[PDB]
Amino acid sequence: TFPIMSNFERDFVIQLVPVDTEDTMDQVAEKCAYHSINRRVHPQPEKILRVRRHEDGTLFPRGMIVSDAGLRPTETLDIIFMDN
């Protein structure tokens, strides 16, 4: 259980999203989407949701878990649309 700040692509606003230390980037992305996709952002199912650290642009692999990310509690995360 770890607080992050979701900056979802094409949304207008950063949101508080509780995630889990055990979550994969994929599963971070899902938990984020919940609060943006179909609320204020259109789904893009030809696309894959990636997680990058907002401060410096660093892109996390789909598969890495939060524990290993080096995240400061409450850290802002960009949730972007990609093909890989």
Partner 1 sequence: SMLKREDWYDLTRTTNWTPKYVTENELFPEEMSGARGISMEAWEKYDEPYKITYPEYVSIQREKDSGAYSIKAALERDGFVDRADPGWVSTMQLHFGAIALEEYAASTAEARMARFAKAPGNRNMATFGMMDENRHGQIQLYFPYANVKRSRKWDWAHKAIHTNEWAAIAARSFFDDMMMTRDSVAVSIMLTFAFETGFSNMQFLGLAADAAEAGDHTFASLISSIQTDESRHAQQGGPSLKILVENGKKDEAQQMVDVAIWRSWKLFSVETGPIMDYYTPLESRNQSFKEFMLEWIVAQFERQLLDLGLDKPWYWDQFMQDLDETHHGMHLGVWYWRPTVWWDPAAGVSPEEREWLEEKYPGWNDTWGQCWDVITDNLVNGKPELTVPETLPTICNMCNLPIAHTPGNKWNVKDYQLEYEGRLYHFGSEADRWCFQIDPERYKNHTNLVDRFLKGEIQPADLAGALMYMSLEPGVMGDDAHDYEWVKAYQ
- Residue among 21, 48, 74, 84 that touches partner 1 (CB under 8 A): 74
Q: What are phi and psi of 67, to 5 degrees?
A: -40, -40
Check: CB of residue 66 under 8 Å from CB of residue 21.
Answer: yes
User: Is there binding between residue 72 and partner 1 (CB under 8 A)?
Assistant: yes
| E strand or H helix that includes residue 17 | strand 15-19
Beta bridge partners of residue 21, listed in sequence order: none
Restricted to residues 29-58, the positions that interact with partner 1 (CB under 8 A) are 34-35, 38-42, 54-55
DSSP state of 37: B
- Residue among 10, 21, 47, 70 that touches partner 1 (CB under 8 A): 10
What are the residues binding partner 1 (CB under 8 A)?
3, 5, 7, 9-17, 34-35, 38-42, 54-55, 72-76
